[PDB]
Amino acid sequence: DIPQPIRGDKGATVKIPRNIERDRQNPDMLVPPETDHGTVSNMKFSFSDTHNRLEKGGYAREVTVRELPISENLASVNMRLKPGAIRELHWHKEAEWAYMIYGSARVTIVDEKGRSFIDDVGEGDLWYFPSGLPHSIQALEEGAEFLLVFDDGSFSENSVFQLTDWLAHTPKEVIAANFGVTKEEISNLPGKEKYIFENQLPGSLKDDIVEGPNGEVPYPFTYRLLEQEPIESEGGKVYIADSTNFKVSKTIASALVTVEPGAMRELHWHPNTHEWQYYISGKARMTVFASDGHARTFNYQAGDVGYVPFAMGHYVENIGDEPLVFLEIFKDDHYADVSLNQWLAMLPETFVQAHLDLGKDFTDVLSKEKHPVVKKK
Amino acid sequence: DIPQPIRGDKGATVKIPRNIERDRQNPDMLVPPETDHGTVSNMKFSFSDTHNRLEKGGYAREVTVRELPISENLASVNMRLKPGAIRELHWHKEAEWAYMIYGSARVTIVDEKGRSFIDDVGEGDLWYFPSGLPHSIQALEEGAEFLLVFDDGSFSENSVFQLTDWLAHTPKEVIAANFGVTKEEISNLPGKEKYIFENQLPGSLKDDIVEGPNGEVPYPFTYRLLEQEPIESEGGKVYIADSTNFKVSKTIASALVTVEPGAMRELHWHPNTHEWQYYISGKARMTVFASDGHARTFNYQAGDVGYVPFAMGHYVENIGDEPLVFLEIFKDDHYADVSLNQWLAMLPETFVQAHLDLGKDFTDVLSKEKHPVVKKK
Amino acid sequence: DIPQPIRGDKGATVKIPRNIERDRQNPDMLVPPETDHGTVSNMKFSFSDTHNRLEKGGYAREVTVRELPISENLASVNMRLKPGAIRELHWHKEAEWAYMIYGSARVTIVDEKGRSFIDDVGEGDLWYFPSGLPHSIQALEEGAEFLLVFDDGSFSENSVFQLTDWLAHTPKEVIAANFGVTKEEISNLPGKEKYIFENQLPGSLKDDIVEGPNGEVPYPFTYRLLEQEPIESEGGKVYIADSTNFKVSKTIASALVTVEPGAMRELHWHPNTHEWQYYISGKARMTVFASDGHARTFNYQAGDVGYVPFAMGHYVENIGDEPLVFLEIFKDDHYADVSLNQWLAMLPETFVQAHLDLGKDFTDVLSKEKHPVVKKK
Amino acid sequence: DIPQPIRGDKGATVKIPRNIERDRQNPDMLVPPETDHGTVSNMKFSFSDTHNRLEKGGYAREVTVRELPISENLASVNMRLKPGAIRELHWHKEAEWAYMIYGSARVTIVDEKGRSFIDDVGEGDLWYFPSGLPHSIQALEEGAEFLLVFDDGSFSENSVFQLTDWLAHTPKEVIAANFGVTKEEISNLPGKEKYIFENQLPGSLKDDIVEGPNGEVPYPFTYRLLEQEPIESEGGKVYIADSTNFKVSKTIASALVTVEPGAMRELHWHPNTHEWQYYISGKARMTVFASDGHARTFNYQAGDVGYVPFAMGHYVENIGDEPLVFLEIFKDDHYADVSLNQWLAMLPETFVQAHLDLGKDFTDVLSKEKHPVVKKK
Amino acid sequence: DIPQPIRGDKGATVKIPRNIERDRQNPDMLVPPETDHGTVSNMKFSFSDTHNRLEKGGYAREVTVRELPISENLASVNMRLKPGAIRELHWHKEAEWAYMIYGSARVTIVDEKGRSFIDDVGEGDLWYFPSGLPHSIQALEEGAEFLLVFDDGSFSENSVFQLTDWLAHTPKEVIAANFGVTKEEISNLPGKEKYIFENQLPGSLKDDIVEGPNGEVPYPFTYRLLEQEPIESEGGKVYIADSTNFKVSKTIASALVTVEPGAMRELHWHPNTHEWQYYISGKARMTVFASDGHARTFNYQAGDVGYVPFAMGHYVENIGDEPLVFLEIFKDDHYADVSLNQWLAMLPETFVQAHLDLGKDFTDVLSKEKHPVVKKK
Numbered sequence A, B, C, D, E: 001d002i003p004q005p006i007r008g009d010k011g012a013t014v015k016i017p018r019n020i021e022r023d024r025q026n027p028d029m030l031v032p033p034e035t036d037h038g039t040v041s042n043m044k045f046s047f048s049d050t051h052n053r054l055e056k057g058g059y060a061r062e063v064t065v066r067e068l069p070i071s072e073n074l075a076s077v078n079m080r081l082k083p084g085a086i087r088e089l090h091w092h093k094e095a096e097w098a099y100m101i102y103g104s105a106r107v108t109i110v111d112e113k114g115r116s117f118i119d120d121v122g123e124g125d126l127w128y129f130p131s132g133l134p135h136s137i138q139a140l141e142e143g144a145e146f147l148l149v150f151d152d153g154s155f156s157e158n159s160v161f162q163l164t165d166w167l168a169h170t171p172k173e174v175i176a177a178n179f180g181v182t183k184e185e186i187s188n189l190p191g192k193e194k195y196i197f198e199n200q201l202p203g204s205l206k207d208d209i210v211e212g213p214n215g216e217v218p219y220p221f222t223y224r225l226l227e228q229e230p231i232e233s234e235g236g237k238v239y240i241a242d243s244t245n246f247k248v249s250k251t252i253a254s255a256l257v258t259v260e261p262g263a264m265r266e267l268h269w270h271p272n273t274h275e276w277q278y279y280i281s282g283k284a285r286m287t288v289f290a291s292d293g294h295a296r297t298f299n300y301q302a303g304d305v306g307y308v309p310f311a312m313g314h315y316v317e318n319i320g321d322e323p324l325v326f327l328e329i330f331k332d333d334h335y336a337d338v339s340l341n342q343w344l345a346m347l348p349e350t351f352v353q354a355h356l357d358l359g360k361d362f363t364d365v366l367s368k369e370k371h372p373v374v375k376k377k
């Protein structure tokens, strides 16, 4: 049945040709809360609304500042590899964070000391490659699909440094001299980058491990986020990974949040930096509060990127029947938040009472323990 | 049936939760043309993906640079008034262009010489209010729904100058002194802006006309675009309105394009400025060609804003069953384009032949007459 | 008696209408030193020349980059609370530093671990709230007046995040769900921010202290600057507070300087960052030396903000009859300066002699001990 | 013999490895005039110091803001075509100005009204293609070498819009539909841009001329600069071409200056805009005077680009044995200059005398007639 | 013999007046590698192409962002002092790094604690003065010539803070008061900066050392780079100095590289920051690879500054008969690089094989030990 932008006696029927399907996806936007007010930048964008780069062995599509101007510090790729397919050995200026949503893959990485690290990554695992270190991904028997996050919003999947593209653009004489071979011995180097290519499934991880004169890396570039004990509350759970626990992960701080139906990520903000969001599954609404009485509510579902500017107040409410599952990303060495609840709970009852024009009956429910996700009892 | 991002042996099935509805709306994006390549900014955005401001008597929602960063020079509002509802008397820095999609409305405007202009606007009509001149809209018995375009992408519907908001923020003594009345005589001024408000239907246009010491305005601020004889070709028609014919319309140049099914707005570019697009009805695809072999294809349908950076090559192909109807907007005193066809048609056969590695059989079909929209005979 | 901009045979009488009162306040500007030269940005601005925001229970006025463009990194509020008046619970992006000039007040603050800190602040005390942590001020029986400094010059007192303003702009359903109460139980929440409001005087500090599951904060957010032993010299004293001693105070470094009549803050610069100044009492002049022989002298008195760009040479001379008292603020984790005197004192006599075309009689007076404020013996 | 940076008792011998060849080319830079002073941006750059793009049939190298940051408004290409070689049909955002130094070539251009213009260009001729209009160059039996100037310093020869590159990046179906042919009929379109390619010499100009439904262009896009009577003075001559005489040339104003040995382009400035310079032959020095007593002298010879910021005082002195020949380019609809000489000549003798502390003997030589190039009698 | 920009059947003879001398210096630019492609910023600039500031006792010339826009973070001075000549006591915002190419000199520096450090510096030695600390240089009996690097590309040698220039622009009364002398006692202070001046040779270093109330500096501001054991490979050696070994050197990381004829600095990049280069002696070529298949080759020799943007792939090949010697500078607390060779050497043979379409015969030569400079055996 057709929704209309009408709230009480405000609003009216749409009379011109419209996108009913999207109107349906965005109820709190066709009909915002009465408490919404003023202008805020766009805080939502769908991967389905982006050009998809198709290759032999997979695909990559991106959400960058070119799509979502508010996110100047952070950009993202949704990438897919078919079984055995290789995302070509490459590097880039930006540091890279990743979450494996579907399947598994082997990654390689070499650090600035000539040490290589090679690991398999399963669903619910992260990896993090520091700025400038060369790496690669190769999916296993199930193939693989994942989210990449880069710590610069100007990033583009099409302007990364590929191994073969470097070679093809280096004088043969110089390549030959570099390795001490003849020109002929390298006559067959690719004349073009590969980016993503089909390849036979890799062997066992153990058969791949390369030891060297310089020894093991100090710290691993992969982390089993879902093997961690989550912060658990009534309405759901939160799995945090930042530099304090996922050691190499210096420029990216993360939390995977799961929200039961009827639950919600509570009212809070972040006193460190901006929040970048990706929605893995479910349906949500968020109101971002930007001060000076400016406030706007966005709807999100699977494949949607979201965003909360530094310190803006928000909440994430599950408005669907299925679990709501999303990521919280920050460009920072740690996760941090202030809970509205915990905050007031830690101040004198009467002081809070004087602020809210409410009484004991309200301050009584305040809780000093933090519960990031609560249920609608 | 479910679409997948697969083209020949490139691409793969989506394995993670997805937005199938949007995937369906964007076929040429889930599966771009093989000839697409490289990165281009986002050139498409839907009004359905924006917060809608609901008032008593209508609504307004906007697409600004905050949503579509590529469009720094141009922004847009989709506004709706219920019958008799008034968009409050107001002004702003930006010049304003408008197209009446549904219904009709009376507008008023006063110029820098103290001359007022008052007209009724029907479907297919435009108006254009020069930077800084105060105006208002009032819908008639059918109500009204229209598109507004402003010649600065930083524009926001929420930061316009409203009559009552000015007064409420002016010292009463000063207001009283200004008009030579007492404070009491204006005690009842609104304490708040109205923005949009319900009101009884207006009388006849003739009963409203105000004459003054300074006489008629030199030129009208409304234009009957659809009363013009269109440039007509096989596949459809083009109705142009720019400063050369719609005289006051100095900073905005416009064309309403209608494209029969199986037809297409031909291959061309614009040698003056950027193109801002709004899609009134139908389904389309456009490829924007950005040089250095960069090219990207976007899908559009009703409620969608589009965009082509200065001189980028494009075409607009109807890929639907119904007529395709859209606006072309420029920040310029005239419309202008170069037709690929007409271009080659006006050069030596053999010269063109030498360029395209084709022969007479191709140059023979070239046409020196411009046909902006052609059919698939 | 009327001052004129005449120096020897340079300058002339003012012949047009003028501001004699200001001319009097700015002697070294109507008549600069002969050694002044070239253009420098404006380095002085008076709080008396700003719009004052008046509320029930106090006032706030600000000096931001909008008033003093040279100060891009730092901005300031002069705030006043009547006895018992509360500056509403709030937070903001910027970190906040403070100096209590008159009276006293209770502050509260909660950190990112859900720990609250509550303290009373008297004259000559500082507080420092890290970016993003929620806080509040409540004046005691004497009321309170203080200076706030924020580590971004784009700061505005009117765009802070207020508790009640957040709530009023959050859907009631969501608020209710957040705390697990009914809509009715919060029906009486303020429909508007309070910002500053009248309230009964608070109880004892001890009765207010809130303990919690997470324990005491590691470090206090208040510092008794005047209880410290000052660096004392002949002409006056300097009380420094930076991250090395006021531990939480990571982004702001400070010094309160007192200068007897006939004394002066010596010739120096700062090799770390810019200097932001506030003048609490007295009359001063400063010459800022900007290299390339550019130099300009400014006059300052109570209520005046001043400023010295990174590494520019300066001095602060008391030119009044009463003590001169001012603050030195830096956006940095430590205070640091180079004394011209100490500098030359630590180099070979003859080397210095060769530089200044002076002799032993001059190098003899140089001192290796730093004396930040000297007297005119 | 080896030059050293020594002037009187200032300076010293170079003691580290050096570029003697360049030192020789830059005498007034190794050893500037005593009257030089302070910092000025770099005002000189050599085409020999740029990467040269080599193609089949010629080459192109550029000087852009990426090489010469002071020139933000203007950039340049030095292009070379072998006999019959075609610079591929193309267009771009920037307007283009040109001077034929060696040989000749046929150009084509189509305007926004579908009118084509086709002309042959010889040595000493200019052309000017307005922003966005498609064009091409084809050298004749002698081949051709010329200078291109573009009215944006961000221009790059590698990011122009090529005909074939557009087609190769347009869906075949869409191309086919555009022209009403089959896919097969265009199967043989180039899969890649050509940029510059070898081709047989063109026929007579008359055999190439294409008439059309829309008639002759209003004005020609080529101008015989050297067929004009030059402003002639003792030391040389000046050939000006701007919008007042070369009608289409709206955004570019030009002058070809020839300076006999012992002569010099007199002391002057330009009260409209910046000056961009190219040196065709000879050796010169220029001092640019930037006010605040800042002044710097540059040496120039064949292949060198130069530059004078808006209104900066300068002169161009021939310091070689051969004629000095260079271009003066402006981004403006007209050429204009103020002659120092003419200026003083038009003011009261005694007034000028009072300024320069000279007497009648000096004012007597002043001349009211402008002589842009004077000789050292 | 005359070089021409011809490669196989690409390119053509230059037909217009040209700079053959530079053409000769830039072989890989007149005739780039076939593998070069696309646009890159300018990465090369010669000190011989700059205005030289001549003083009594030496000279200074600079390469700043005003000459080389790509280098926004880093600028450089080539300075020369005659025996006993003093670069006047001064300070500046920027931190300063230095390499002594010819001769020796005494430097002085005072830190923020009033501690002075005084040392003699010989060929192959570095010094590093932290932002804002006052210093000076005085050459010994041989005179001195060195390279200075400053950690801001906007730096200008003409806008430094000089001791005497400060004094001359400070009111005499204030100077007198500062030191507690009379105006007369300082009547003879220079009325102008000195910048560089002639002076008698200094005594022994030991006679100059100044002790003070505050003791020795924690760490020395000079470092004997060439006394270190170099990383030595077949083709040459690398001497690294960064914050890990040259302790005070916090914002600048450095390496002196020497390359035998027939050798080359291997294929690598830097995963931390940009590379700024200075060429001390020899002839080289470098190709910088900028991704998206963009690549450009530059020629360098003595007196040339070079540059590699963050993470761009490069190599430095000696193309001369004499040793090639150059500096690598970074704005960072450590040196770091990734070797292409070492990188592939640390990954599974077959994985690498699958990337390069080569076989065992190639992976066999890969080496896990890093060899920064290799020879053409």
Ligand SMILES: [Mn+2]
Pocket (backbone or CB within 6 Å): A090, A091, A092, A096, A135
């Ligand atoms: Mn990557």
Ligand SMILES: [Mn+2]
Pocket (backbone or CB within 6 Å): A268, A269, A270, A275, A308, A314, A328
């Ligand atoms: Mn959050």
Ligand SMILES: [Mn+2]
Pocket (backbone or CB within 6 Å): B090, B091, B092, B096, B135
């Ligand atoms: Mn309007």
Ligand SMILES: [Mn+2]
Pocket (backbone or CB within 6 Å): B268, B269, B270, B275, B308, B314, B328
């Ligand atoms: Mn168009």
Ligand SMILES: [Mn+2]
Pocket (backbone or CB within 6 Å): C090, C091, C092, C096, C135
């Ligand atoms: Mn605050």
Ligand SMILES: [Mn+2]
Pocket (backbone or CB within 6 Å): C268, C269, C270, C275, C308, C314, C328
């Ligand atoms: Mn100071």
Ligand SMILES: [Mn+2]
Pocket (backbone or CB within 6 Å): D090, D091, D092, D096, D135
């Ligand atoms: Mn062109």
Ligand SMILES: [Mn+2]
Pocket (backbone or CB within 6 Å): D268, D269, D270, D275, D308, D314, D328
């Ligand atoms: Mn000129």
Ligand SMILES: [Mn+2]
Pocket (backbone or CB within 6 Å): E090, E091, E092, E096, E135
């Ligand atoms: Mn220095």
Ligand SMILES: [Mn+2]
Pocket (backbone or CB within 6 Å): E268, E269, E270, E275, E308, E314, E328
């Ligand atoms: Mn390197």
